[PDB]
TrEMBL record:
Its main location: membrane. Gene3D superfamilies: Cytochrome P450. It comes from Danio rerio (Zebrafish). Its cofactor is heme. This is Cytochrome P450 17A2 precursor. The keyword Metal-binding applies.
Length: 406
């Protein structure tokens, strides 16, 4: 796989490669210094994204955030979303009530070598359809899960894809249509408020961008977080001792009861370190979304023509033995104290869900670990740590035994 291939080649040929496709050049960047040039130092010049056709379909031809070109239209559009992610004092609430749902379904499978994934998909999807449309067991969804899995699978291996996006677009359009500038209840509310306001176009966002942003916040919110929960628990199975310590940390500073609040984070540094280790050892995107050069620029000491694509090899920088000790190995300790670590990227294209992901990961990893304990079953393996990329780096299915405290 690309991220392993260019990681291996970096030791002996440079940390910087070039590939040619048509008449457009692609640089691969696999050294911390050079990625900070791309993402920080000269962040703005590399802030373009490419116009593929699969992404077009996904986002109605660059009407989202992640696959849209940097532009005044994009900067105001991002501002709106950012504001918005920020209150959400909210959740907490939203998260904790889904964590209770999740957590109360897990005990219903006590001593069951369940296969936790359907359960986590439903949990995170609740948090998200909720935080975006205030939507809610059930369901139409299968439908959501059904259309999400259809899109992911189509891309994993169209034709089949359009129809799947079309399902999502109509469904979302209905909730967009149905959707108080004082006290917003939804991320979609916030987006319509800001769209309302702007006299733009030309530069203010059409509402389509709302539909697309709402559609993207799903994809991103569910697929990144699901995976990070699946990875987290996978690792805590190969390392039971560490599972105990985090539980011991949780015991000592939160009760055996108090739903861990967001105000407990400074007091729970080993847990935060575990989330940061999970982020490090399995990048959700071992290669970022291509950054495109918005003008003639440079990198290393070399001119980079405008239109050049730049793949950031985040696996390489997070596994670089020059900046990490035994990066293959799993130590949240390596973060125990208070160069190369950018789990959400950096600069103008940094993750927009970073605030949310930190908060959302904390609140129901603390809680599953507060009420439950996760073990490799007797007649199963340990989970396979290699994992598979598309559309994020996720682990293969694994089976896990849950048992509560008492
Ligand atoms: C859970 C762990 C997550 C990690 C580690 C992560 C990491 C990243 C990274 C590395 C980037 C790209 C940086 C770049 O291209 O320059 C990114 C982009 C993005 N992430 Fe995340 N992300 C996570 C979760 C989420 C969530 C939950 C959302 C929900 C909305 C989200 C939305 C986005 C979006 C919209 C972008 C595109 C940013 C842009 O083009 O400016 N991410 N993320
Ligand atoms: C393809 C998918 C997931 C499947 C959806 O059906 C369509 C979709 C829309 C936006 C994509 C998302 C997966 C993760 C993506 C690719 C990304 C992301 C990836 C990792 C971390 N943060 C953000 C932001 C846009 C996100
Ligand atoms: Hg489908
Ligand atoms: Hg505490
Ligand atoms: Hg096992």
């Amino acid at each position: 796989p690309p991220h392993l291939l260019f990681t291996q080649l970096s030791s002996q040929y440079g940390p910087l490669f070039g590939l040619y496709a048509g008449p457009h050049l692609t640089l691969v960047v696999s050294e911390i210094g050079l990625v900070r040039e791309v993402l920080l130092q000269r962040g703005r010049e590399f802030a373009g994204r490419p116009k593929m056709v699969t992404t077009d379909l996904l986002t109605q031809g660059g009407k989202d955030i992640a696959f849209a070109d940097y532009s005044p239209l994009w900067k105001n559009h991002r501002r709106l979303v950012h504001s918005s992610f920020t209150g959400s004092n909210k959740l907490q609430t939203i998260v904790q009530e889904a964590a209770d749902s999740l957590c109360e379904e897990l005990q219903a499978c006590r001593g069951q070598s369940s296969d936790l994934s359907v359960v986590l998909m439903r949990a995170v999807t609740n948090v998200i359809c909720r935080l975006v449309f205030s939507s809610s067991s059930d369901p139409e969804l299968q439908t959501v899960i059904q259309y999400n899995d259809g899109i992911v699978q189509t891309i994993a291996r169209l034709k089949r894809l359009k129809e799947c996006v079309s399902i999502r677009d109509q469904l979302l359009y209905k909730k967009l249509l149905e959707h108080t500038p004082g006290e917003p209840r939804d991320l979609l509310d916030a987006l319509l408020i800001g769209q309302q306001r702007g006299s733009g176009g030309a530069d203010d966002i059409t509402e389509d961008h709302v539909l697309m942003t709402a559609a993207e916040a799903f994809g991103a919110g569910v697929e990144t977080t699901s995976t990070t929960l699946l990875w987290t628990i996978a690792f805590l199975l190969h390392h039971p001792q560490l599972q105990e310590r985090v539980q011991a940390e949780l015991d000592e500073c939160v009760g055996v009861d108090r739903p861990p609040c967001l105000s407990d984070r400074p007091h729970l540094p080993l847990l935060d370190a575990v989330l940061c280790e999970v982020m490090r050892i399995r990048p959700v995107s071992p290669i970022l979304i291509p950054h495109v050069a918005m003008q003639d620029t440079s990198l290393g000491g070399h001119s980079v023509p405008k239109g050049t694509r730049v793949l950031v090899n985040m696996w390489a920088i997070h596994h670089d033995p020059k900046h990490w000790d035994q990066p293959e190995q799993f130590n949240p300790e390596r973060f125990l104290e208070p160069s190369s670590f950018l789990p959400f990227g950096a600069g103008p294209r940094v993750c927009v869900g970073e605030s949310l992901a930190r908060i959302e990961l904390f609140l129901f990893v603390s809680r599953p670990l507060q009420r439950f304990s996760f073990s490799c079953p007797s007649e199963a393996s340990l989970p396979d740590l290699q994992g598979r990329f598309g559309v994020v780096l996720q682990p293969e299915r694994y089976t896990v035994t849950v048992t509560p405290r008492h």
